[PDB]
Structures are given as structure tokens and as C-alpha cells.
Amino acid sequence: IRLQELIKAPSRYNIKIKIRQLPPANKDAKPLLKEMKKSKEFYVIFDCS
Amino acid sequence: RWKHPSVDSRDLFYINLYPDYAAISRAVLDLVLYYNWKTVTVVYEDSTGL
Numbered sequence: 320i321r322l323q324e325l326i327k328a329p330s331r332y333n334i335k336i337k338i339r340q341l342p343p344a345n346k347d348a349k350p351l352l353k354e355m356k357k358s359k360e361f362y363v364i365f366d367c368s
Numbered sequence: 369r370w371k372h373p374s375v376d377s378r379d380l381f382y383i384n385l386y387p388d389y390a391a392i393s394r395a396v397l398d399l400v401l402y403y404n405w406k407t408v409t410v411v412y413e414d415s416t417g418l
Contacts, residue, residue, distance in 0.1 A: 323415035343375075 322366055341367065 328334045337360065339351055355363070370386045400408065412418060 320415055323418075326415070326418070 325336065326338075329336060341348060341351065369384070370389075371382075371384055373382075
């Protein structure tokens with residue numbers, strides 16, 4: 320809901336978006352950070368409280 | 369039908385027969401990965417769709 324228009328962005332732009340989800344509790348971020356290690360990206364946004 | 373789950377309180381009185389979003393979502397994952405289409409798009413009605 321904070322990032323819906325970011326989801327719309329490819330609809331008129333050349334942007335490519337990589338959406339990830341954080342399962343509840345702070346212990347689930349480890350697999351996501353490891354896959355961030357495996358998949359090389361440097362442009363990350365954290366949508367969280 | 370579908371009701372937004374209480375993500376802050378726990379209630380045992382939730383009797384919803386509406387199918388889970390997770391099951392249908394993994395079903396469509398299954399069909400698309402079976403069909404091995406590496407070039408796909410999706411369209412959705414609103415942010416409520418996602």
C-alpha cells in the first residue's frame with residue numbers, strides 16, 4: 320500500500336523491480352540477506368516500520 | 369468469504385471456508401513452473417489484488 324505506484328512503475332517506464340517479502344519475526348531476514356549475497360544487487364529499499 | 373486475518377490478536381473463532389490465498393498462489397506457481405514460460409506478465413485490478 321505504500322509502494323503500489325512503484326508496482327505501477329513498469330506499466331509506463333523501463334524500470335525493473337525486485338519485490339521481496341519479510342516473514343514475521345526478525346529471524347527470517349537471514350535467508351533473504353543470503354540470497355542477496357547470491358544475487359548481486361546494490362539498489363535496495365526497506366519498506367518497514 | 370475472505371476476511372483480513374487479525375495479525376495482532378489471536379482468535380480461535382475464525383471459521384472461514386474461503387480458500388487460502390497461499391494455496392491458490394502456490395497452485396499458480398506450480399502450473400507456471402510446470403509450463404516453463406520464462407517470459408510472463410500479470411495484470412491486477414488494484415493493490416488489494418496483490
